Structures are given as structure tokens and as C-alpha cells.
């Protein structure tokens, strides 16, 4: 079936790359959603965030306009209650902004970690009336008006790290120079990458700017890129992008994958999906009005 | 490093629990105080003091003479003037009485909240010449007496509730019967826990009374007992107990805890418990000691 073999997949992914994982975790997540990883947008994933270790992450996205997942995952015990403002965020979400899709993502040693709201590309203003949002956020305004980040494109409630990512379609000309992201990052004190890296952020579609409850600034931000197929990812930055883009179990042949670029205070790390169905990486490009 | 595990292992605490919490704060208490979170009798503690909210606070104790968690903090802009007696209170009490140790705990959410004073185990009338305690501590003489509340073994000032605490050695025989605390929380119109917690309350070896400067009342009683592993916590009795018994992180395998039944007015903030996870494996021994217990 194509659940078991997306099950075996996964389990192969985490063996292969020495990827901490639960099987009983596993169980549990593919007891709720295990038939939505055959039918949707589902990704494998693999970063590296920990020094000398691999973390595994597998997610999905389907095109309805209520938050599936959050049902899902309550009645499986997946996620309870925390007493903290992420409980209702997401509730929140999609009472202030008409969503178009829903996602969410797992953590195959945890559990599920976050639930993703995909409205229609929307001004960004439109987030600063969510209750429970962290201060932060309405506090980065000018932050969101200085580098261009006004075409809100996806939110996120990551359940584990309390916090929340608000995402962006990178689609001003500024963004397109890497004096762009040498400044952005400069502005929060994160690690400016080699140039070869800037390079590569010039053509990043989307920015992901996190923020929590413990802190005024912003926590990390991330840049993400795709790539058509195993052959140009850029292999030689990276260990792990080049064994993930080269040994990736998907359904076809030549899969595409999407790479996130992550930076935060001196975290700085890799993050590679493999577009399991082939669904993800063209709902991508169409979301960013770009062609394949 | 140690001190950077024993950080993160407090934020992944007070994350799991969704307990509120400063990275600012946590920098600040980690400036100044980090080296002794690594060396001495660490614990992290949750308690579900807020209704329906986990808060977190981490504390340590170390066997010192003087109180050197006072000039730390003062040093690093942790603890100030307030216009308050409790400027002077610490300093009072080492100088009333000779400490074997002190301690500190500290709000992730907020900064220094309590040091403390360990004596030797003392007669409780030792305590009554401290000049800034709250009147209502020598009002209660005679409430000391009739609950055996005679052997004082610890002195706390809490800075930002405003609040003193004196322990005591729960070592009288009338403190092993369920109706010494049905008699106790009942002569402060406190709230009397089930059947079972009393039969929890008669093992324990401490007993905290809190006084303070806004009142005559006693405004808050806890009682303390120790666990030697995860397994023997009575994990049924309290989700958070259950929880942070099974995960609460530490250097060593199986941890001991340190258990606190706290009871005040329903009214306020009510009845609630804390839990210490003895994170380098001294608290608990040390508990059983300064208690001349076995464990």
C-alpha cells in the first residue's frame, strides 16, 4: 500500500541518516494521519539543527480551508492543551484570515510540532489583529515595511518550540540584490553567509521570520528556494544536501525539493524536503506567481 | 559545557510545560549564578501556583557559611533597594543566627525571588530578635507551640511577594497523625486536601509557614516531603507531578524529587503543588539529612 511503503520510507530515511525517531511516536502520528500522507502535498525532510546530527521531520499540506490537522491531532492525543498562548493561536488564525490551505508538520522523535495556516497571499496587516500573536510581532512593523515584507504568504504554530513563523512572498526588486539579506541579517545580528550562499538567497521566494513569548526580537529567519530535481540542488555546499538530494525516496523518479536556509544567533543550519508525490514543489512556484 | 546543558534543559522545561518565561531573565540569572547551578545542589522546579498555568523557577543550595547569593545578586543588578524591610532581612537573619548554608530560587519569568538561610536546627525563639521579620511571627508564639513547630531548620526572604518563611523539622509524633494537619489548615480557615494527601502530608519532614508585612494572618503553609526516584512520586495525584516526575531532565538516570503540598485561602490563590527535580543528585540527601532520616 502506499501508506506502508510511505511508513518505510520514512523509517529507511531516519536509519539512513542516523535520525533520532520513535517508532511508537510514528505509530502514533500515521494512526491519525497516514492516509493523509498518501493523498496530499506530504514531504520527507531532513536538517541538520543539531551539531554532527540529522533530525527527521515529515509534513503535509492539503488545499481545505479549515484547519484539518488541529482536529486530527486532538482527538489522537497528538496535541493537548499546554496552558500557553499557542493553544488557541491557530484557532485564531483561521478566524482572521479565510485560509485557502492547511498543513502540518511532525518531528518523528516528538510528535507533531506545527500547524500551518495558507491564506491567500494577504497584506501583512491583516495578521496584527490575531489575539494571541507574541507581542514582538506588531512590535516589528517598520522591521516588516524596511525589508519589503508586506505579502503575507503562510503562518505557523510550532506547538514544541512555542512559537510562530509568519511567512512572506519575496517578491520585491531588493530582494532580488544580496545587499538584501546581507542587510536583514546584519539588522538582527545573525551570521552573514558566503557569498555563493547570498547568491542562492537572491532567488528565494519565501521569508520566514519566527517569533515567541519570551523574548522582544526576532528568534530566526529562514529562506527557502526549490529545485526541479535531485541534480540542482546545490550538493557541494552541503553533506547532507547532497546525500538527501541524491538518496531521497519519493514515488517517481526524479522528485524535486525544496532547501531552507536558516539563521539566528551565533540557529544557522540546512533544511531539505523531498517533494514525496511530486505536488509540492509545483504548489510552490504557483503560490509565488512564478513559473516552474 | 555543563552550565550551557543545565540552560537549555531549563528552557526545554519551561517550553514542555508552557510555563511563561524571559530569555532576558534567564541570560541575567545565568551571569551570575551559572557556575553555581553546575557545582552545587541544583533543582528545576515547576509548580501549578497559577490556575490552569505551569510556572518555573530553579534554585540551588550550597553548604557556605555566608550569603553569597546576596552579593551575587546585588552585583548583578538582580536584587535592589526596594524601601522595603526585606532590604535588610537577609542580613538580620545571618547575623542572628549561623548559617551552615544558603540558597537562592529564581522566577524564569521575573529574576531573584527567595534566598534562604540554613542553621543547624534550632529552637524557633532564635529567630524572634530579627528586628525587620513581620510582627506577626512573634504574634504567633503560641501557635508555634501548640503545632510543635520547635525546631526551626531554615529562614526564607522572598523579595518580590513581600514574604518571609520559617521551617521547621517535622519531628513530633503528634506530626505523624492526619488529624495534626486537618487541625493546622483548619485553624487558618484553609482548604482540607483528601484523605490521601493527608496520608502524604504525615511523611513530611518540613513544614513552611509564610508571614509578611500586610497582615496579622498566617498566609500560606506548605509541607514538604522527598521521593528517591521517578516511580515513587505519586504521580495519580497531579498531572504536573505526573508529567514532570516521568520527563523532568537531569545528570543522572533516575533522579530523586522534591515534592511541596502548598495550601493558603481558597479565595486567593488556594492549594497547589511543587515539584524539585534533583537535577545533580545532592538535594535529596541532603533533605534526608538536615531531617536525620535515612534514605
Given at each position: 500500500?502506499?501508506?506502508n511503503?510511505?511508513?518505510?520510507?520514512?523509517?529507511?530515511?531516519?536509519?539512513?541518516?542516523?535520525?533520532?525517531?520513535?517508532?511508537?511516536?510514528i505509530?502514533?502520528?500515521?494512526?491519525g494521519?497516514g492516509?493523509?500522507?498518501?493523498?496530499t502535498?506530504?514531504?520527507?525532510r531532513?536538517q541538520?539543527?543539531?551539531?554532527?546530527?540529522?533530525?527527521?521531520?515529515?509534513?503535509?499540506?492539503?488545499?481545505?480551508?479549515?484547519?484539518l490537522?488541529?482536529?486530527i491531532?486532538?482527538?489522537s492525543?497528538l496535541?493537548?492543551?499546554?496552558?500557553?498562548?499557542?493553544?488557541?493561536?491557530?484557532?485564531?488564525?483561521?478566524?482572521?484570515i479565510?485560509?485557502?490551505?492547511?498543513?502540518?508538520?511532525?518531528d518523528?522523535?516528538y510528535?507533531?510540532?506545527?500547524?500551518w495556516?495558507?491564506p491567500?497571499?494577504?497584506?501583512?496587516?491583516?495578521?496584527?489583529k490575531?489575539?494571541?500573536?507574541p507581542?514582538?510581532?506588531?512590535?516589528?512593523?517598520?522591521?516588516?515595511?524596511?525589508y519589503?515584507?508586506?505579502?503575507?504568504?503562510?503562518?505557523?504554530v510550532?506547538?514544541?518550540?512555542?512559537?510562530?513563523?509568519?511567512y512572506?512572498?519575496?517578491?520585491?526588486?531588493?530582494?532580488?540584490?544580496?545587499?538584501?539579506?546581507k542587510?536583514?541579517?546584519?539588522?538582527?545580528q545573525?551570521?552573514?553567509?558566503?557569498?555563493?550562499?547570498?547568491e542562492?538567497?537572491?532567488?528565494?521566494?519565501e521569508?520566514?521570520?519566527?517569533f515567541n513569548?519570551s523574548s522582544?526580537?526576532?528568534?530566526?529567519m529562514?529562506?527557502?528556494?526549490a529545485?526541479v530535481?535531485?541534480?540542482?540542488?546545490?550538493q557541494?555546499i552541503?553533506?547532507v544536501?547532497?546525500?538527501?538530494?541524491?538518496?531521497?525516496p519519493?514515488?517517481?523518479?526524479?522528485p524535486?525539493?525544496?532547501?531552507?536556509?536558516?539563521?539566528?544567533?551565533?540557529?544557522?543550519?540546512?533544511?531539505?524536503?523531498?517533494?514525496?508525490?511530486?505536488?509540492?514543489?509545483?504548489?510552490?512556484?504557483?503560490?509565488h506567481?512564478?513559473?516552474?
Amino acid at each position: 500500500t502506499i501508506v506502508n511503503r510511505i511508513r518505510t520510507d520514512v523509517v529507511n530515511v531516519a536509519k539512513s541518516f542516523g535520525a533520532e525517531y520513535s517508532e511508537a511516536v510514528i505509530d502514533q502520528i500515521f494512526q491519525g494521519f497516514g492516509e493523509k500522507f498518501t493523498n496530499t502535498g506530504f514531504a520527507i525532510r531532513v536538517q541538520n539543527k543539531r551539531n554532527q546530527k540529522v533530525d527527521c521531520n515529515i509534513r503535509y499540506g492539503e488545499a481545505k480551508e479549515n484547519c484539518l490537522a488541529w482536529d486530527i491531532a486532538r482527538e489522537s492525543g497528538l496535541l493537548s492543551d499546554q496552558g500557553h498562548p499557542v493553544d488557541t493561536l491557530i484557532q485564531e488564525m483561521f478566524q482572521a484570515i479565510p485560509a485557502i490551505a492547511y498543513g502540518a508538520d511532525f518531528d518523528i522523535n516528538y510528535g507533531l510540532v506545527k500547524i500551518w495556516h495558507l491564506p491567500k497571499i494577504v497584506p501583512v496587516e491583516e495578521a496584527f489583529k490575531i489575539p494571541s500573536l507574541p507581542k514582538s510581532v506588531n512590535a516589528h512593523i517598520d522591521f516588516f515595511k524596511k525589508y519589503h515584507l508586506d505579502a503575507l504568504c503562510a503562518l505557523t504554530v510550532d506547538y514544541r518550540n512555542k512559537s510562530t513563523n509568519l511567512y512572506f512572498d519575496a517578491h520585491h526588486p531588493e530582494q532580488r540584490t544580496t545587499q538584501f539579506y546581507k542587510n536583514i541579517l546584519q539588522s538582527q545580528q545573525f551570521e552573514v553567509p558566503s557569498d555563493e550562499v547570498l547568491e542562492i538567497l537572491v532567488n528565494c521566494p519565501e521569508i520566514a521570520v519566527t517569533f515567541n513569548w519570551s523574548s522582544p526580537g526576532i528568534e530566526r529567519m529562514c529562506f527557502y528556494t526549490a529545485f526541479v530535481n535531485r541534480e540542482t540542488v546545490p550538493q557541494h555546499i552541503n553533506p547532507v544536501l547532497k546525500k538527501f538530494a541524491q538518496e531521497a525516496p519519493a514515488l517517481l523518479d526524479n522528485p524535486g525539493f525544496l532547501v531552507g536556509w536558516s539563521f539566528g544567533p551565533d540557529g544557522t543550519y540546512i533544511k531539505i524536503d523531498v517533494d514525496y508525490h511530486g505536488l509540492v514543489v509545483p504548489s510552490f512556484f504557483h503560490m509565488h506567481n512564478l513559473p516552474l
